Design a protein around this ligand. Structure first.
Ligand SMILES: NC(=O)c1ccc[n+]([C@@H]2C[C@H](COP(=O)(O)OP(=O)(O)OC[C@H]3O[C@@H](n4cnc5c(N)ncnc54)[C@H](O)[C@@H]3O)[C@@H](O)[C@H]2O)c1
Length: 209
DNA sequence: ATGTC
């Protein structure tokens, strides 16, 4: 019988530690189309233009790159591309943070969001704006440690939670890191912003490859 | 096993 979703429902954004100062200085994650002051790109360039044109067919609309993106799992396929040095970025997974919030925190804050049931660039992805539709997602595929096949699982593992334009830092509940050295560098950075929320910093090696 | 498609 099919796994239900966790409540609260965690959402996960991976970023390079060299971006954490910018996030704290702005007080928010910014969508790609808001030109975040990032220091490090961990993306594939060749899938960027698809996200700049992929229309979001739920209000508030626009395109995928109008939204701050999250997965419903850690240890994403995107992280595997980074871990394996397939990206232009060659720093590997160790400096990649998982920033963790929940879908309910976003709804409670009244921020406009949408979410998908699969990788968002796919033309057959479904989009939702009601948290009751989390039932439409495949929680087995989202939680799978082996995702490369079959193809439906690979697609559904990459269901996304999308928050329009910006995501306030105060909604982050945990920063998860690969190593004790990265956790210590994260706390150093949080201490430079003594008025910012300070989420717990947890080493979760099992969220990495 | 997995190099986001
Ligand atoms: N990052 C994720 O967890 C995630 C989740 C779901 C989908 N995706 C998509 C996969 C693909 C590559 O991802 P990503 O590299 O995140 O996207 P991107 O290529 O749009 O890069 C935006 C970068 O800016 C960073 N950032 C945002 N706000 C700030 C700020 N205020 N100061 C400094 N840096 C900031 C953000 O963390 C990310 O590293 C994009 O198309 C994403 O939309 C990513």
């Amino acid at each position: 019988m099919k796994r239900t979703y966790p409540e609260p429902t965690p959402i996960y954004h991976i970023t390079h530690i060299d971006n954490l100062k910018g996030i704290l200085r702005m007080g928010k994650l910014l969508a790609h189309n808001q030109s975040p002051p990032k220091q490090r790109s961990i993306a594939y360039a060749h899938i960027q233009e698809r996200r700049n044109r992929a229309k979001v067919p739920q209000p508030p609309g626009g395109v995928l790159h109008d939204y701050v993106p999250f997965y419903f799992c850690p240890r994403s396929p995107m992280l595997y591309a980074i871990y394996s040095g397939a990206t232009e970025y060659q720093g590997g997974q160790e400096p990649i943070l998982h920033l963790v919030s929940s879908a309910q925190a976003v709804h409670k804050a009244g921020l406009p969001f949408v979410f998908t049931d699969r990788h968002g660039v796919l033309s057959h992805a479904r989009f939702f704006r009601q948290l009751e539709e989390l039932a439409q997602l495949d929680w087995e595929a989202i939680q799978a440690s082996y995702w490369a096949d079959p193809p439906e699982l690979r697609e559904k593992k990459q269901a996304a939670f999308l928050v329009y334009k910006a995501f306030p830092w105060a909604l982050i509940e945990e920063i998860a890191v690969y190593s004790q050295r990265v956790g210590e560098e994260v706390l150093k950075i949080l201490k430079q912003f003594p008025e910012a929320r300070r989420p717990r910093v947890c080493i979760r090696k099992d969220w990495y490859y």
